[PDB]
Amino acid sequence: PPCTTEELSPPPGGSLVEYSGGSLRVPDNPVVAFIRGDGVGPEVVESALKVVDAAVKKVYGGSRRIVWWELLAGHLAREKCGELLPKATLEGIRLARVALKGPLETPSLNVAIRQALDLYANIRPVRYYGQPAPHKYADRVDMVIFRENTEDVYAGIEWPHDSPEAARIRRFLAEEFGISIREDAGIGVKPISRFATRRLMERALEWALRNGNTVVTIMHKGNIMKYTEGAFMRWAYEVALEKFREHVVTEQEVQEKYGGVRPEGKILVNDRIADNMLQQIITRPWDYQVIVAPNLNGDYISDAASALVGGIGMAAGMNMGDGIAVAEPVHGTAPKYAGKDLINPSAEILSASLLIGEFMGWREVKSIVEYAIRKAVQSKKVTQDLARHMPGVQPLRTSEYTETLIAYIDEADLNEVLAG
Template sequence: MFQKIKPPEGGKFIEVKDGKLIVPDNPIVPHIDGDGIGPEVITAARRMVDAAVEAAYGGKRKIVWWKIYAGIEAEPIYGTLLPEDTLNAIRTAKVALKGPMTTPIGSGWRSVNVALRQLLDLYANIRPVKYIRGIPAPHKYADKVDIVIFRENTEDVYAGIEWKYDSPEAEKVREFLKKEFNIELRPDTGIGLKPISRFATRRIMNKAMEWALKYGRKRVTVMHKGNIMKYTEGYFKIWAFEFAKEKYGDKVVFEEELQGGEIPEGKILVNDRIADNMFNQIITRPWDYEIIVTPNLNGDYLSDAAAALVGGLGVAPGANVGDYIGMFEPIHGSAPKYAGKNVANPTAATLSAAMMLDHIGWHEAANLLRKAIEETIASGKVTQDIARHLGIQPLSTTEFTEEVIKNIKKLGGSS
């Protein structure tokens, strides 16, 4: 199955049985270090995860890490940025921890990040945004931000259907539009298509509803620009509501049914917001939003904006999840100018790894990891990206990691 890698000894693969993940006490977990600061933050995250698993389970459980390759690191080994070995490893292992990778703008290869999500059908991009004590957040209500964004991961602009303005394909599309629909575009127009399907909309809504039920969330909001793009984003809203009523009818209530009243006990409120208003709302009334479901591009914008409210991308985790497979990664970029300097903040990568632990059902270790990170940051022990706003001496990536591990050991298995 694998050409240039082989699974490590001493571990077992996670399996799927009767629609559920069957997780051994020693699961093999692949990791892609990524580009730029990726190797530093992923190494730090793995150290903290190992410490949390050890403390939470007293040595009865252990992750067996498996290095695999994608991006710049993969090219000299495989002659490609995304080898089949990597895809097969993640399909087999069911989970992976991934560092940030560089994506060129305007030219060069298409995003390896996007390719991984599409080829593995990781259709739900899940981005929790929650304030951490001690972060110098710019927002007045930062401590009230606790939002999980579910961004559809396979359609909209991520479908990648576009043609350069001077290509023969673009010319054909312009001619077709003029001939068939009397739509005339300027001859120097680049063209992209924005597909949004009922199928993809329903399954991202299902992921959001499952999360709401699992973690006791009371509000699920569908964000869209359906007042303008009526047959794409408009139907994203229509299909999402349709699905919620069809599958979760006894568990949901819609905004128009409340008439200004409280959400009934045991119910989840399903509502919607126009995209531009959604940005206004998360700034002025963040406490009104718990889960937000979006098409692809909206979710990209919104998750970065929400992360800014609580202090920035350095503390923002992310996950890309399909029916069973999950790939967990920070949402920040590869920051090449900081690579190799031991100054990068590993918090986002580590919180992404905590999401991975939740995904496999190791909630005790995940909670311990989150508590230790918050305790460390709240005590003023932070990396340079946070320290410069506080006017204090920063810790290196390694020093911060050591401080988190100390707090993991101090907190023990009390999570």
């Protein structure tokens, strides 16, 4: 496994995924980079490769074969190459276009990867797998959050209240704009751009078109923050109408042209005030599918949705750029379950299924992997984090849950798994 950009050597038995003109090109023997990561990461990434690879083989009958390619990040990289994040990893992902990733410790390194590959879109699916859940309507949560991951107040533009830099900003704002900010105030800046908004909405719409989603909802506080969040909403509606006119419909258009009903074959593009959006996913979760949001709103809504379905530890994610994606769990390294064989690998498995099934196009892999996880929960064969919430259920270990899952995958009839 490579330690310098010249060492860069992908496995022979696999062709590269291509980018070069709008369309991503995926062959039958595709190279997918995998990173082990830190803590529970090696535990759960190895768990996923075993699961996905019993599928891909069980799903396509053998014509397809995923070729796993190792890249080093975290403790494993520091043990070999002598650094936490090597350049050869970034260039490895850059040539492969697709990669799967465990959590990394930050003594964050996640942000470096994102910033170096321009992974501007954070993608978080939230779905119900039958677990014990606090939401009466957990089973009607079937959502994907498209979260802008480069701007907003999360860009780190801020200064301590007692810093000379904050003092210079305060006086600058006062003198030039008659803005008054207290002397004992910390100061942050919130940038939202047309370019970043447009890219994110384009990816969200292309995703909706791919999966036959019928609603895309922009989540914003544009009534109060007119020029950042309101601009976000306006720019999102604008690209939608500009580049997706024929695939797209507006709430007003529905209530003017189509007798109050969204036409089949067409996506409803709407918007919700951010605090209202939180209320609506709780009250009317069936009304929402794809949610498009700036950084913070996206962070909050995805977290809230995962809590509703009792999937906090099970949340899977993915960071996507133009021709490139890196899938990873929401959770951290969990240093208290690592090397313990106790942790839930569900998040890491679903992440693999997100990348391979929902972004490469291999829809049949997602279908089965999710069938198994649902079957695991139905017959109460899961790890301690779930088993602690079910009366009198014995926890199944991590390595046990994997083999349990492979079993459900191969044992399954594909006429009941792949329909419509």
